[PDB]
Amino acid sequence: MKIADYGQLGEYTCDAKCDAEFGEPGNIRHLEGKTYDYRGVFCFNRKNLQEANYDFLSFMIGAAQRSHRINRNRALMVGDGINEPKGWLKEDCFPTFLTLPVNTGTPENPVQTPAFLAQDWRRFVTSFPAEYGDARSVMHQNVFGYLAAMVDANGRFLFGDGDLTFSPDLVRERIRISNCLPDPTEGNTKGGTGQDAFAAGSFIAAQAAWKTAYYAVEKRPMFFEQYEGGSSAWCVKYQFGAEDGGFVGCCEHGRVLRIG
Amino acid sequence: NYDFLSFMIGAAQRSHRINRNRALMVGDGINEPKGWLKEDCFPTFLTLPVNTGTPENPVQTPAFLAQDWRRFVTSFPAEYGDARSVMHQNVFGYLAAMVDANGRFLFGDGDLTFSPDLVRERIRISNCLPDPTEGNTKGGTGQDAFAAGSFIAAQAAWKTAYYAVEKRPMFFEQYEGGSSAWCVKYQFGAEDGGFVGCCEHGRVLRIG
Amino acid sequence: MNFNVGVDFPSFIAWDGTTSFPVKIDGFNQFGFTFKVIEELTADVPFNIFYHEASEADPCVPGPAIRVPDVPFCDGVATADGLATVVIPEAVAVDSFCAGSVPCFNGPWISIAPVTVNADSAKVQVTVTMKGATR
Amino acid sequence: MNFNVGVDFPSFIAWDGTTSFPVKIDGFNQFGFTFKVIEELTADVPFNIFYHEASEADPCVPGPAIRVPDVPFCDGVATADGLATVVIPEAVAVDSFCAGSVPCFNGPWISIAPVTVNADSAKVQVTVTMKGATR
């Protein structure tokens, strides 16, 4: 279910009225979702499989599960609803915020260059509506490194100062790092001035109350079996699959930051 | 299969709460209590602009700096006693993101974020109030410049600057004369109000 | 998975924009309309609701159209002339739809037609949906 | 009593006898077709099932028509060209209806048009129904 609205029943009325006005009642809705199917197949030749000195069967049995995990984790993020769970970076429902450019030229012939500065991180992080509860950020480690390696106008470090390296308590800071997300620095080669500047529109970080902004549904774990109908006396076939799904929840509980 | 009576009761109570809170602040006196924001009796403090142009060709732009907040807060007469400030969360977020000339943050410095103890700071945040930043989109330079006269924050001794009077809490009853053998009807209502007390015990800060 | 939802919840065209087709509802115990626009409107458009009785000569062919009566609810306004009607506001966007229904059945046929046929009425489409076959 | 079925099971026109309208199936879990004849047929009438995807010029407008591929079942025969089609026999009476559906979704829009626009094609009507919302 879902409570779209509550309505506006009462009103402030004059004491001379004996009657009252009928208010507009609320609205409720019913919603439903599906579960999707993951399937695959691979083939072997009996003679080679028997005479080879390496266990290709178990190698493939491991590779299949690794690929399943990778693909599920990526599909929940950028999938489309046709046959995959629809992702929150694809649905484009979370509000987007753009980072202003920085002028690097003279006052009369300015040069606008896209940029990402330290105070933008604090501005973005502290703007989460308080009523929605606690939230957590997600980033690619290169973004965190680029942020931690900043210096002020005098050459001294921001954040950890007087120390060779800076390493805050991430759990306390409410930041989670995972290299799955897009990387704006392009492997630490971009982020300066001139030709090395960022590219406009690049993804940086996202924040939300996940426990109510996105859901994941579990139905079946992976299974393997031999396909007797294609197996022959000289070559063999296997089949496997699993089922799972996911859907978005409250679109208002999310926030995405991007380079403007 | 879904109970509607309790839903309607909850909606009624929620609407009552929202309407009362809105009226006490910005309500007009016709059929609702008059709020202090609508009355606009508290004396006002403005904010100077800042010249963003060359000295001989000034470009006057409205602004709001860190020291203005301290100046406003520290100038409350001590005779009136305890006082607290109220302002939108975006104002606090815009204030906490300021930097000095070299680039280092003011307030919480050497750390990723600033989160003071508002209970000790004597600040209570409320999103109902006007937001001068326009959803974190205004507050820069040029096209991003503030709009003059925008509300920023207020401070007062509320326990003598405003009063809330309550007479009867809400009640629900069934209208016997309208509920036939195949229908039903319910009625509800309540009475309440408030009035502005001493208008000298408050202050308002605005852009100039 | 996918289902043959047409087995349990069939739908029939009710107003094409140039011709009105009676819709039989004898074998179904629920029904409702669905309005959609094809291009931006310029003014409001009202619609009338009619029903029919089984023709005398042939019981499988509808009779002449009749105007549906009104039915005030437990408490609320009533129509000026006491006959049910529907009005589509001009602010409806192309990428949306509207759902409405009548509280009573009357005859075994139902129909819907605009008050006046014009360019505005030529931009609207109405379709009827049933539920719960009883035979 | 009566319900507002249009809220949960909206219905949209797909073929009114002269024009085909793309229908947005992206926001619903399931869907199906519904065929009704308005006059006795004289020859077979086959139909074609297409689908569209969001156009790059505007994501809210469908792109060019693509044709659905076939999906054979276990005990069944694959179509000659591997493309879905539907055929309505001449035995269909004016006082009945037929319901059919497709097992796969593909693009977010769907459409149905006849193989050829002949005289008999104007005697048929096709409507689409959706069964569960997801947005």
């Binding site: 915020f97 | 815009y94 959803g135 991003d144 | 966007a93 949306s96 | -």
Partner: peptide
Amino acid sequence: MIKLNCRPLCQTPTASRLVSPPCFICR
């Protein structure tokens, strides 16, 4: 007078700029 129930099909994104306090603007 029947009352209609309406709601849209297609959503639309929404992007906004993020403006932070400028450099040490001084009087």
